[PDB]
Design a protein around this ligand. Structure first.
Ligand SMILES: Nc1nc2c(ncn2[C@@H]2O[C@H](COP(=O)(O)OP(=O)(O)NP(=O)(O)O)[C@@H](O)[C@H]2O)c(=O)[nH]1
Ligand SMILES: [Mg+2]
Ligand SMILES: [Mg+2]
Ligand SMILES: [Mg+2]
Ligand SMILES: [Mg+2]
Ligand SMILES: [Mg+2]
Ligand SMILES: [Mg+2]
Ligand SMILES: [Mg+2]
Ligand SMILES: [Mg+2]
Ligand SMILES: [Mg+2]
Ligand SMILES: [Mg+2]
Ligand SMILES: [Mg+2]
Ligand SMILES: [Mg+2]
Ligand SMILES: [Mg+2]
Ligand SMILES: [Mg+2]
Ligand SMILES: [Mg+2]
Ligand SMILES: [Mg+2]
Ligand SMILES: [Mg+2]
Ligand SMILES: [Mg+2]
Ligand SMILES: [Zn+2]
Lengths: 311, 95, 87, 37, 115
RNA sequence: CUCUUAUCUUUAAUCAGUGAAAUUGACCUUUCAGUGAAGAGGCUGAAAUAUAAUAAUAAGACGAGAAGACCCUAUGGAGCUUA
RNA sequence: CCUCAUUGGAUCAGGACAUCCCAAUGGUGUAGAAGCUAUUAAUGGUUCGUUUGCAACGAUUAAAGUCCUACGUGAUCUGAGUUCAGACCGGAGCAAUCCAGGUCGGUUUCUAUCUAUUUACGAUUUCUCCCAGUACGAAAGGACAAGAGAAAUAGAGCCACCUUACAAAUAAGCGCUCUCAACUUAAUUUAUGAAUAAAAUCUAAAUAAAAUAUAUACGUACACCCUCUAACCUAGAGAAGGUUA
């Protein structure tokens, strides 16, 4: 059943491509014309990832946090999350599901009311309220543009929404979202951090799909699912994958998953008499499918940051 | 080697003292034609090994001696319990 | 290629007096059946080592003492000797 | 020995010499006081 | 000859290697001024997300006459302090390791068979 | 790729036959420092220096070519759209 | 009231020194060991990767210097960009079209006429051993010079073995061998001794020494005037050169 995931000797998750650097320059130059800044994030990870530069660099303008992907997360203790987020200095926080337009109406009134309290100086005469959305990759940041684009303007998708990280590269032009308040949105590429804090946060930050999985291997991460999935008690993979009984060993579960999916490779193994190519079950493919089921929410709702939020 | 010697030591400090004394005596005690011997394991904090021309001495702390069990291997050349657990395998296809 | 080159500090391991053969450590420039120039080494270490060697030259006509057919260096293991056992 | 543009004595014991084309202040008591032009 | 990115066979009984894992270990660094690794040369492996030191005890490339050429590139895992990770080695190890400059007595003690 | 290697064919090279092309102010057509417009085989001052081929390299002759690029000009055009 | 657009790499590198390592020294809040600062010196060297479009890291190293040569170098090669003919989104405009906003796609060729150039050298660095776990130091810890041995790289060669070829008598490296002397100096340190009554003072006073990197004084290599029908050659594009009971 294991006790604690081994994290000794593993390295941190460094992704930080060049576009996440040229991008950060454009975002800084765009402060001129931004009334408010919106941070999107993954509801499953309330207190991790969270590129600190956004508060640092973009702290000049008022801020609003929008925890996305709430549908595939456990929000029983949502009240608790707010209490601590209040301690962090994030008075206003929103939970929204982009795909099924949950709670997305409330965002615009709060942005309106939030702006009223602040000053506008050079832009005090402009009648168009332009705000800006930032966050780590694959948090629904581009989707949020479309969900509001339709909810209010009832027009249609305007930003390319994609599963894998890195779809939106550069800081784009404004995208009109509403007509009555005349609210425009600036879409920007996902930035993680120059240096994630801990090996675990970086491991969690890959679970939700924020960083390309091959940078972590997809084998030191599938193991993490089994640990937390069993630890948190969500024994759903057994039924979904028709496993014999609960287990806490990747080599065993991935052996079962691979057989179920009828996937095998021809892999070169090195024995004592010389290299030999032997057909074997796809441990790699099972890890992907095991990861891709979790992320799709069919394995259950999770609260990866638990016992960190309560405290 | 002709002779294999294993001796436990109280602490890391004691281990260094014993190794240094033996090497000092070794140079003094003749061996004028015979070459010199290195002290190995100084980076290690619990196990030091000095290999003379025909004798090898390993000095280690009690726990290190218990884990490695050098005595059993050399006493029981092929019947050591740890060795027994190491089996052989082959590589057949999966069907 | 086809240039004059010199190799420095090659040891002499053995001399065959009957066939006038010299055994020189390592490689020598040129192809087989190529003529070479042999002279005492000019390196600093062996500055005045020709004290022991025949100073003008080796005269066989003098016949002061008749040389063995094969001359060896002490470290050399000669064939027909007992097999080496590093006891 | 610091190579400075102006040489100035710093204590009573410091003395001056003209060696190898340059001016030196050399102090036996305090070697810190040594300067070259 | 072992280089960067070579695939290696851990010949200990240590759990780090012994445990069957879909990926073999791959060399990340060779501790030499020459990039190549031969018998007795340490290397840094990437084994199951972990970076671990190791020592080469045999390889498939030919060597000088009277030395044994193995059929697999054999390696032993050593701790950072230099003590071997595993406690036993049942595969033959060449006797050249004794005289090579370095610390090999600890590994030789753990090895029962010598070739 | 580490880190290249060997062989064969093509081409190359030598012999025989046939025989183009862009290009070309004149040339008895050197190196260094200076001067100069980013600039010198040719100017200033030092220096070097028997004469002609054959086979190689491409630093230079701001090397040679094409209807290439870029900005601006004309009381020069043309296609397209309109309110 | 707003604004905004040549440079990487590969190959081969020439040079500056404002020195990153290697070498010789002054000072210290330099006990030793680690360091800090400055002088002197251009000697050879100054790694491999990952994400990258500029950085961001990993593992090493004695060190991974800073610059100049029209990105040093495209008639040596290559990726961007400038930047277009097609096409989409976002934002403009009544439209055609447009944006120094995104993106995907997307043809520069050259036979070298001239200059210039194409046939030797006398080695750098690192680790281990010893001195010696000593000198020093309360302990912790822990040297220098002197001396011996290993490799790495570079340069020059070779084929007995090994390996890979020609399913040839050969060529290669993944194999093997060899690599050194310093007359001449700079920072700096001594000895003798005047200007200057010293039992002072290293001296752009007369003097005597020691002391980096450099280098060619000093060596090795070369050295012969050379028949040629032709054949042969471990010599070669041709010519040249070697060999011929
Ligand atoms: N289940 C679920 N999936 C969502 C939700 N919002 C977005 N997604 C998923 O997330 C992906 C889209 O991410 P996107 O909206 O482009 O976000 P981004 O952060 O702007 N992308 P990038 O990584 O390029 O920065 C798709 O796989 C989409 O289905 C949501 O509320 N629920
Ligand atoms: Mg002809
Ligand atoms: Mg002329
Ligand atoms: Mg000039
Ligand atoms: Mg002139
Ligand atoms: Mg011709
Ligand atoms: Mg030219
Ligand atoms: Mg006009
Ligand atoms: Mg007109
Ligand atoms: Mg150079
Ligand atoms: Mg200097
Ligand atoms: Mg050119
Ligand atoms: Mg050409
Ligand atoms: Mg068109
Ligand atoms: Mg393209
Ligand atoms: Mg195509
Ligand atoms: Mg394009
Ligand atoms: Mg030519
Ligand atoms: Mg010494
Ligand atoms: Zn003074």
């Amino acid at each position: 059943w294991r006790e604690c995931f081994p994290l000794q000797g593993h390295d941190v998750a460094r992704w930080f491509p060049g576009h996440m650097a040229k991008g950060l320059k454009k975002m800084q130059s765009s402060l001129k014309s931004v009334d408010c800044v919106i941070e999107v994030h993954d509801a499953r990870i309330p207190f991790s990832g969270r590129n600190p530069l956004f508060q640092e660099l973009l702290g000049l303008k008022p801020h609003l946090l929008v925890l996305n992907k709430m549908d595939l997360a456990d929000l029983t203790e949502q009240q608790k999350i707010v209490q601590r987020l209040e301690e962090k200095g994030l008075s206003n926080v929103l939970f929204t599901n982009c795909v099924k337009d949950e709670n997305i109406k409330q965002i615009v009134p709060k942005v309106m009311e939030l702006i009223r309290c602040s000053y506008r100086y050079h832009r005090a005469e402009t009648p168009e309220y332009c705000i800006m959305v930032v966050g780590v990759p694959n948090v629904g940041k581009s989707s949020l543009i479309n969900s509001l684009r339709r909810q209010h303007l009832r027009t249609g998708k305007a930003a390319r929404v994609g599963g894998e990280p890195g779809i939106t590269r550069a800081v784009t032009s404004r995208i009109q979202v509403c007509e009555r308040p005349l609210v425009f949105l600036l879409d920007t590429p996902g930035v993680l951090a120059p240096r994630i804090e801990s090996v675990e946060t970086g491991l969690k930050l890959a679970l939700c799909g924020t960083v390309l999985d091959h940078l972590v291997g997809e084998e030191t991460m599938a193991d993490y699912l089994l640990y937390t999935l069993n630890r948190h008690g969500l024994f759903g993979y057994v039924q979904h994958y028709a496993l014999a009984s609960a287990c806490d060993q990747i080599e065993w579960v991935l052996k079962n998953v691979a057989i179920k999916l009828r996937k095998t490779r021809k892999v070169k193994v090195l024995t004592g008499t010389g290299n030999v190519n032997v057909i074997q079950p796809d441990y790699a493919m099972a890890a992907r499918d095991f990861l891709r089921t979790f992320r799709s929410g069919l394995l259950g709702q999770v609260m990866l940051d638990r016992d960190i939020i309560p405290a | 080697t002709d002779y294999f010697v294993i001796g436990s030591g109280t602490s890391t400090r004691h281990l260094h003292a014993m190794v240094h004394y033996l090497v000092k005596m070794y140079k003094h005690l003749k061996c004028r034609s015979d070459p010199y011997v290195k002290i190995e394991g100084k980076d290690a904090d619990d196990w030091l090994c000095v290999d003379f021309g025909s004798m090898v001495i390993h000095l280690m702390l009690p726990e290190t001696r218990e884990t490695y069990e050098l005595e059993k291997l050399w006493t029981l050349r092929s019947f050591d319990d740890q060795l027994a657990q190491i089996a052989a395998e082959t590589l057949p296809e999966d069907f | 290629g086809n240039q004059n080159r010199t190799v420095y500090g090659l040891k002499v391991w053995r001399v065959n007096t009957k066939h006038n053969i010299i055994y020189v450590n390592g490689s020598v420039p040129g192809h087989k059946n190529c003529l070479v120039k042999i002279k005492d080494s000019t390196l600093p270490a062996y500055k005045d080592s020709c004290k022991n060697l025949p100073f003008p030259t080796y005269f066989p006509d003098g016949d002061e003492e008749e040389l063995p057919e094969d001359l060896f260096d002490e470290s050399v293991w000669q064939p027909s000797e007992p097999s080496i056992t590093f006891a | 020995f610091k190579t400075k543009g102006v040489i100035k004595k710093r204590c009573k014991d410091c003395y001056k010499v003209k060696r190898r084309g340059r001016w030196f202040i050399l102090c036996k008591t305090n070697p810190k006081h040594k300067q070259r032009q | 000859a072992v280089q960067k990115m070579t695939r290696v066979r851990v010949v200990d009984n240590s759990a780090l290697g012994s445990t069957p894992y879909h990926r073999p270990p791959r060399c990340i660094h060779v501790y030499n001024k020459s990039g190549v690794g031969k018998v007795g040369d340490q290397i840094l492996l990437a084994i199951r997300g972990q970076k671990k030191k190791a020592l080469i005890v045999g390889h498939r490339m030919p060597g000088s006459r009277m030395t044994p050429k193995f059929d697999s590139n054999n390696v032993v895992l050593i701790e950072d302090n230099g003590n071997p990770v595993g406690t036993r080695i049942k595969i033959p190890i060449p006797t050249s390791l004794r005289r090579r400059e370095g610390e090999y007595s600890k590994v030789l003690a753990i090895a029962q068979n010598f070739v």
